DNA sequence: CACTCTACCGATAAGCAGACGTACCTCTCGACCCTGTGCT
């Protein structure tokens, strides 16, 4: 709205860090796929479905 | 028929050992030996 905020903001430069935790590295979904040979249950791990 | 010395099955603890330990998730990195015996 271009309107002047009622509160005054604490604004300034701050040193931030990008961390090795990226959402796309973590997002995982399984419907069906590989199973363990012995127990025949879904295998472990995002990387292996 | 008053005694006190050993037999008992009891209980006592005793030291023993053996037995247990949040959840779910991501990734990387490394994985026998020793000696008989035929080959050439």
Q: What angle do CA A27, A44, A42 make, to 5 degrees?
A: 100
d(CA A19, CA A41): 34
Position of tokens 């249950």? Answer: A41
Nucleotides of chain B touched by protein CB (<7 A): 25-28
A28 closest CA partner among A3, A7, A8, A49: A49
- What is the spatial distance, in angstroms and rounded to an integer, between the CA atom of A12 and the C1' atom of B16? 71
Burial (CB < 10 A; 0-12, 13-18, 19+), residue A43, is middle
Distance from residue A24 (CA) to nucleotide B2 (C1'), in Å? 102
Distance from CA(A6) to C1'(B10), angstroms, rounded: 91
């Amino acid at each position: 709205t271009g309107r002047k905020l009622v509160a005054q903001v604490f604004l300034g430069p701050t040193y931030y860090q990008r961390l090795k935790h990226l959402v796309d590295d973590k997002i995982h979904a399984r419907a069906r796929g590989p199973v363990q040979i012995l127990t025949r249950q879904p295998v472990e791990g995002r990387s292996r479905d």
